Amino acid sequence: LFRSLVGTSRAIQQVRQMMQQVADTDASVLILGESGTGKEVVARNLHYHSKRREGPFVPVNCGAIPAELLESELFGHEKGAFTGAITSRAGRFELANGGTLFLDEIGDMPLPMQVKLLRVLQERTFERVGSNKTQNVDVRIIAATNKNLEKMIEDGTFREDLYYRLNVFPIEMAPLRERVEDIALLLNELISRMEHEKRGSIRFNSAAIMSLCRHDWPGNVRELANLVERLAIMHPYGVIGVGELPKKFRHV
Ligand SMILES: Nc1ncnc2c1ncn2[C@@H]1O[C@H](COP(=O)(O)OP(=O)(O)OP(O)(O)=S)[C@@H](O)[C@H]1O
Ligand SMILES: [Mg+2]
């Protein structure tokens, strides 16, 4: 379903309270933060605590999709619309109807698609590729990004009108290095996940934890999770001390 946002930091306690406020509303939510800072966790929780909780949760990875197939991927197509179209699609939007659409890295959505997304947010309608059957769509938008959208507006790479439409309820995720007090609790959570799934077990002694609390965590919680996995393989059911950490994680 959805996992919980572990932590005792002021910043994370804020996020939970903001989540509870906006969740069972239909406001568009924009979640900002570095890679691996729990942005999808926040999005999934928002959904399953929402009026749409029994509806579908439909991700769109704005980075991945090739722009040639992008409009098609998001809005579907009747067959004939272009080449090779001999089986048809409802787009990610139609698939999300009565549910939540999670736009992962909205900063990577190309300008022409930003315009079409604004239409959905405004007119709540859309066109399948090559069609004129203006179908209506009933989705809640949650978007996430690690980019500086306001700068992109200035650069002309992101639309101001879309921005103000999407950024009704922003939620900022603090990077791990700004919430180091949470690292021990995160470890406990990550190790407990690992045990539940028969994938191993470790624990960290206080020396190791101190050193981890001084790490920069450019990959944030996903990097933290990666280190836990690796240490469980190298030292199964072992205790991790400063010496068992890789050199880049030692800070003494
Ligand atoms: N506060 C948290 N409590 C528990 N698990 C967390 C927390 N923050 C992140 N995680 C976990 O850390 C991993 C990465 O979190 P995600 O939500 O996928 O990150 P993200 O911000 O969406 O980064 P990207 O854009 O997908 S790289 C997942 O396995 C999450 O379950
Ligand atoms: Mg993600």
UniProtKB/TrEMBL annotation:
GO MF terms, alphabetically ordered: ATP binding; sequence-specific DNA binding
Keywords: ATP-binding, DNA-binding, Nucleotide-binding, Transcription, Transcription regulation
Domain Sigma-54 factor interaction: 5-233
Keyword presence, S-adenosyl-L-methionine: no
Any one Gene Ontology BP term: regulation of DNA-templated transcription
Domain of life: Bacteria
Protein name, as recorded: AAA domain-containing protein
Organism: Pseudomonas aeruginosa
Lineage, broadest ranks: Bacteria, Pseudomonadati, Pseudomonadota, Gammaproteobacteria, Pseudomonadales
Residue span relative to the full protein: 142 to 393 of 490
